[PDB]
Symmetry: C2
Subunit: 140 residues, 2 copies
């Protein structure tokens, strides 16, 4: 039963980077990428055509998204009894203290600020993979 | 850039000494506080006794099995408190019973880690805790 990872990111460059890191991952997984907050909620809530969507074991979320603020996605995921158990890793450009605090207040599992260079973002995502997919004991 | 405060609630001397060893190698400016029981943990977080004016932690490492007060209760106390719920909590405990894991995530633990009885295994795991949470994650400003 490979781990299902949901990435909510609209930046092609950033999503392709995540795919590349996970590409050589030794842990069998399935990466699903959505580009906006409305698609993300529909998928997670398994609404309509998404009724057969797989439950993610881990969610990578950028607070800055098209169609629906990732901050709303975070809040709605963490207040939903059927989804709040799923670990959410915020990976965003935003770094102001107010955003960080509010995000942890909404119960985000961890907040990561995307590195200024892709070379470093690559290593950051490698860190996400190693910790959440190989070190952590995820909920069933 | 104030030093990061890390609180470790663990009664097992072997395990806490191992954490000290790993966190000692860190290049991240910080202070490690080690408490041995559940009541001591609550006293520290509520800033009572010698902990008056003690800065809140930016990261909490918590063993669920503790004397005096259940680590599971401590976890619940922290995540339900408006003035402490923002603090990341990493459970590091022996039990890996799926029902115990689920209960912890349901109480909003940031992550659950199973503590191996082998110390070489544990050292590697704590290195992971250090590199991810102390060097990669943006920890929230502790509540005043």
């Amino acid at each position: 039963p490979p781990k299902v990872i949901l990435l909510v990111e609209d930046s092609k460059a950033d999503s392709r980077l995540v795919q590349e890191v996970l590409k050589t991952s030794t842990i069998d997984h399935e990466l699903i990428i959505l580009r906006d907050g409305l698609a993300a909620m529909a998928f997670l809530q398994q609404q309509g055509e998404y009724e057969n969507s797989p439950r993610p074991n881990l969610i990578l979320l950028d607070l800055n998204l098209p169609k629906k603020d990732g901050r709303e996605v975070l809040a709605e995921i963490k207040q939903n009894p059927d989804l709040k158990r799923i670990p959410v890793v915020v990976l965003t450009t935003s770094h102001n203290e107010d955003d960080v605090i509010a995000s942890y207040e909404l119960h985000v599992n961890c907040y990561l600020t995307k590195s200024r260079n892709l070379k470093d973002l690559f290593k950051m995502v490698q860190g996400i993979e190693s910790f959440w997919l190989e070190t952590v004991t995820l909920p069933a």
